[PDB]
Design a protein around this nucleic acid. Structure first.
Lengths: 315, 76, 228, 49, 248, 49, 230
RNA sequence: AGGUA
């Protein structure tokens, strides 16, 4: 009965092979974070990295023994906090969902120290974790050895796993609020302020929108320079007039050079944004894809907040 | 901070022995004996190894040849 | 009581066009306050000089083709919006652009005046092909504050002029783009501070640091009367 | 509900346009505001670390 | 709750958490801990039945380590009758069930901070000290009788800081109302230390400093790290036949 | 970090000393498994090449 | 180029309610100034608030005395909303002393020459016993923002007296700010708007001083922008 | 045992 177990052998794999240097807490949204990083509370960071704190304190000589370092860290003086920032700066940490269904259930992130008590998770990554912020708890693991740190940065990293292992289409796809913001920004009306204007660059579009001299969506001719990957992999700058909307030009500002403008000159649903990310990854590469995904997240959140999209009793 | 390792994967196409070679480089970096070849921003050995491999200073071959030459001056 | 002020403002710039300025530490919310205030000042109301009215010696409409030119009237009008002009004399001044021959009609082709300085010496305004191979007009450049769309200007203009005075949107403000980002920042153990990141693209009529400092000067100049 | 809202001198649709705090610029179309009974559950983050 | 269903009053009254007036009359005395009612003439038994006294349960640990206290919702001279709510219990006001709080909420995305099902909360909420709960947790320090010697509770603990000794009385028990944090000592328990094995370095150090092994080891109850708060109540249970201490 | 007590101590000492490498060792759980299988009438062993 | 906003009539529809007008403001500046002043007023307003209270009869927040129908925590909560102005001193210690049945209000506090109670009807507690007596030492100090008693308690390390009770101090004097930019019509200049700031304050800070302090803070912040360090 | 995903 001690050998036979479910599921699998108990002590070896499950249940459950407990591990040290780990923490657990409730997760919240991280809408300011970059994709390759996640918010980690100061207290969990201190408790997780106590050996690292001791090592660095004895390295710079602020403590003459491990016991003195322990007293310093339990007093939580401001001195140990700079050491903590130093050890966190490069160290990646693994974030894990309570159930793990596929390999995306564990992903590395660069921890960012935050006052508070909950792990801030990148909004794009919650889709992979199948984690909704309704009290879900995630665990954090610390890859100790240098080989493990490197191994996490190379493989465990979120930016290295932008595509699902079951299908080539990206798994970090804008999901709900950012999609709504993008849709409101790109969806066109039939009449609004500043229709029929002629603009050069999307910068004038953003200026007109932020100044309130035009509406977020209105049919406008804008002169824009689209770049096309052609010949042997060289950018082809073509500058001409497109009939589009102000919100679409504002979005095109975000879009990295190398994509056709036709991808954004349309109403953007979930499918449209997913296809656009897939095209961006296939045409440009990894780094432009990650940067563009982060930028589109920020833009979608901002313009969703500016949208004021609300569900009443009359809608 | 090194957001992406794709550039490193470009130099070392296996993406697994890349971890081994960069781990060896970073361990020689942390354990005393070797001095850096790329400027740092108060960073640990990992992103140093990533940057060194990314600019092509370090791969499997350079690390191996260097451990030879150092073996020859220490034996003298 | 005890008030915190930003230390060690940092600026990294690209030509005289695109500057990112990071400012920290700022007390809770102050990053948004300063960013929004500067953004509104720079965008809505900034003294500058811009093109207002144009001639076309051919068709006196704003959307018809121009003979001898491979560019329609609307987009040659649009070209003038991107033309960065700094006038150092009287408020309204007339520039005559008259050049014959095929090729790109750029800002260098415009005559230089003692009151008007052309910021961009090479800037596509028109293209001339074989048919007439001559382009000619006079353009108003006026000092004004903020951004005045042409559709709004005709609303604010009841004095009528003969057809041929093509009205164009004037961007007196020297900024093509202004944005602010507020991010968490750390100093001592208090983490409620925020970095303010001002990313601004200007037309080159004024250095971005000078633009920001004169915008802040305008804001404080509005303020002093409140303070005693 | 709409009659009671009218008695309170409030918009019938139950949506009021709100001005943003960061920018001081009102959101396009009104947003639904109202007093909702909210509950703090016994799942405090302090216990969860 | 602003938007109720009408079962709030029934749930509050029928549950035992609310002090309900068994016999009506006039409120004779109001106190945060006691409510004394002068019963009406037609509701008193023959002879002298006198007053009705309701002691209010205050700041007692629930089964979820949450505070349950009853506050008097009546005042002097108020006429009350049978079935009236004299004291409002936890999550109860004016006899209505009041689990949570009514708050002004707006349904809109806000820079993605409310992304999945998340809530964004104003600083006014914490400033108003609303949704601020009181958690009364229980700690037990048992002085046992080991074969190495009976354990004892005392203020003097070997090789400890004087800050720990500061918060305790001469009986080794923290004062009621002292503010403590994680790691602070509440009960000065010590256990008779047994035989001690020393490494060669330890023997060298004790030979150098002239120190020797302590006959009793520290076993004082510290506050678990991560929690804080005030010591509101101290209970001492010494079995009959065992000498009492000062605090008991 | 899980079960190798000797490896766990060596890792803690290395991290405190400022060195990042591990002893693979053997998790104590597997040694428990071996001893418990041997507790039956079953032989289990570790053989070199 | 610009006209200058000047402080014009500041009416008081109530003691706690003030409507302050700024007439000569350029169009496009009304919203900027309104938002900036709203932020500064809600964030960095100096004010006077209670920080620590010493009650003779009790040892902690979760106890009660005889002859009071409100829990000591309730007295602390009521004192949190106490509205007081101190002029000369940054920190003052008021003494509250009253026995006998009745509603112990703010006016019962022993008033010094530098301490003004602007809400004398603010009830502190109720004494329901003839011989019940309340004696309290209420420490009121100056500050800005919101400093709860969980941050300076880490900077004091378990304050030595156990008879003193720390309360979260909401130093913010203003409770509500609104601003309306409307078309201010005046003969000179066709394009001008006026900013009407409607303010609800606990009466501790005058609206004139409020606007002046907000402007001072904004100017001090802009000082860094004016001169750039390169 | 109850509760959470």
């Amino acid at each position: 009965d001690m050998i036979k177990g479910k599921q699998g052998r108990f002590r070896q794999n499950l249940l459950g092979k407990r591990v040290d240097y780990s923490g657990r807490s409730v997760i919240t949204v991280g809408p300011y974070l970059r994709l390759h990083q996640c918010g980690l509370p100061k207290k969990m960071a201190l408790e997780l990295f106590k050996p690292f704190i001791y090592g660095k304190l004895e390295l710079r000589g602020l403590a003459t023994t491990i016991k003195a370092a322990k007293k310093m860290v339990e007093r939580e003086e401001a001195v140990v906090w700079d050491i903590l920032d130093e050890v966190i700066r490069e160290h990646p940490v693994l974030l894990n969902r309570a159930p793990t269904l596929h390999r995306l259930g564990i992903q590395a992130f660069e921890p960012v120290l935050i006052e508070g008590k909950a792990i801030q998770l990148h909004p794009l990554v919650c889709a992979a974790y199948n984690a909704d912020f309704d009290g879900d708890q995630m665990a954090v693991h610390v890859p100790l050895t240098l080989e493990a740190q490197l191994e996490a940065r190379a493989l465990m990293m979120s930016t290295n796993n932008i595509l699902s292992p079951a299908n080539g289409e990206p798994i970090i796809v804008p999901s709900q609020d950012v999609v709504l913001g993008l849709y409101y920004m790109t969806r066109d009306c039939v009449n609004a302020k500043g229709e029929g204007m002629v603009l050069t660059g999307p910068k004038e579009a953003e200026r007109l929108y932020r100044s309130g001299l035009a509406s977020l969506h209105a049919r406008v001719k804008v002169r824009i320079t689209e770049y096309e990957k052609d010949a042997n992999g060289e950018l082809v700058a073509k500058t001409s007039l497109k009939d589009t909307t102000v919100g679409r030009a504002i979005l095109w500002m975000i879009v990295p050079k190398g994509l056709p403008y036709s991808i954004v000159n349309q109403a953007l649903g979930k499918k449209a944004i997913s296809k656009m990310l897939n095209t961006c990854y296939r045409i440009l590469g990894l780094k432009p894809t990650v940067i563009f995904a982060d930028q589109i997240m920020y833009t979608g959140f901002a313009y969703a907040a500016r949208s004021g999209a609300s569900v009443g009793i009359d809608d | 901070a090194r957001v992406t390792v794709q550039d490193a994967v470009e130099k070392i196409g296996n993406r697994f022995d890349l971890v081994l070679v960069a781990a060896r480089r970073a361990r020689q970096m942390q354990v005393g004996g070797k001095d850096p070849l790329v400027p740092e921003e108060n960073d640990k050995t990992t992103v140093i190894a990533l940057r060194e491999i990314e600019e092509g200073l370090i791969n499997n071959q350079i690390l191996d040849v260097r451990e030879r030459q150092e073996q020859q001056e220490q034996e003298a | 009581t005890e008030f915190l002020k930003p230390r060690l403002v940092d600026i990294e710039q690209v030509s005289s066009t695109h500057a990112k300025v990071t400012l920290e530490p700022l007390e809770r919310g102050f990053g948004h306050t300063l960013g929004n205030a500067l953004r509104r000042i720079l965008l809505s109301s900034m003294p500058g000089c811009a093109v207002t009215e144009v001639e076309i010696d051919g068709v006196l409409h704003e959307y018809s083709t121009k003979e001898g030119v491979q560019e329609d009237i609307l987009e040659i009008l649009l070209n003038l919006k991107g033309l960065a002009v700094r006038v150092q004399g009287k408020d309204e001044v007339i520039l005559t652009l008259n050049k014959s021959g095929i090729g790109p009609v750029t800002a260098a082709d415009i005559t230089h005046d003692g009151d008007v300085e052309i910021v961009k010496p090479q800037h596509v305004i028109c293209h001339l092909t074989d048919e007439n191979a001559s382009i000619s007009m006079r353009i108003k450049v006026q000092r004004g504050r903020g951004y005045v769309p042409a559709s709004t200007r005709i609303h604010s203009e009841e004095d009528e002029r003969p057809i041929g005075r093509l009205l164009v949107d004037a961007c007196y403000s020297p900024v093509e783009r202004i944005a602010y980002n507020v991010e968490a920042a750390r100093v001592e153990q208090r983490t409620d501070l925020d970095k303010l990141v001002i990313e601004m693209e200007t037309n080159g009529t004024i250095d971005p640091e000078e633009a920001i400092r004169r915008a802040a000067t305008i804001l404080a100049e509005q303020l002093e009367a409140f303070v005693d | 509900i709409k009659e009671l809202l009218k008695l309170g001198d409030l918009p019938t649709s139950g949506q009021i346009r709100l001005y943003d705090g960061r920018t001081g610029e009102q959101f396009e179309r009104p947003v639904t505001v109202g007093y909702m009974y909210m509950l703090k559950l016994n799942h405090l983050v302090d216990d969860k670390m | 709750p602003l938007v109720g269903t009408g079962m709030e009053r029934a749930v509050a009254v029928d549950s035992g958490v609310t002090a309900v007036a068994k016999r009506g009359g006039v409120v004779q005395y109001v106190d945060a801990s006691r409510i004394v009612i002068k019963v009406n003439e037609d509701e008193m038994y023959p002879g002298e039945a006198g007053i009705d006294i309701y002691n209010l349960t205050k700041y007692t640990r629930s089964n979820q380590n949450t505070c349950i206290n009853q506050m008097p919702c009546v005042s002097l001279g108020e006429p009350v009758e049978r079935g009236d709510v004299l004291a409002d219990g936890p999550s109860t006001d004016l006899g209505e069930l009041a689990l949570g709080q009514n708050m002004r909420v707006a349904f809109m995305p806000w820079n993605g901070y409310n992304f999945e099902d998340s809530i964004l909360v104003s600083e006014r909420v914490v400033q108003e000290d609303r949704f601020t709960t009181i958690h009364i947790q229980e700690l037990a320090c048992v002085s046992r009788d080991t074969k190495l010697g009976p354990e004892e509770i005392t203020a003097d603990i070997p090789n400890v800081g004087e800050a720990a000794l500061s918060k305790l009385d001469e009986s080794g028990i923290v004062y009621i109302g002292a503010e403590v944090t994680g790691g602070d000592i509440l009960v000065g328990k010590v256990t008779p230390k047994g035989e001690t094995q020393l490494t060669p370095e330890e023997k060298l150090l004790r030979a150098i400093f002239g120190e020797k092994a302590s006959d009793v080891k520290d076993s004082s109850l510290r506050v678990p790290n991560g929690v804080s708060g005030t010591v509101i109540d101290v209970q001492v249970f010494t079995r009959d036949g065992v000498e009492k201490d000062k605090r008991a | 970090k899980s079960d190798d007590v000797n490896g766990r101590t060596k890792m803690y000492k290395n991290i405190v000393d400022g060195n990042h490498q591990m002893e693979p060792g053997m998790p104590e759980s597997f040694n428990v498994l071996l001893k418990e299988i041997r507790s039956l009438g079953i032989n289990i062993e570790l053989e070199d090449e």
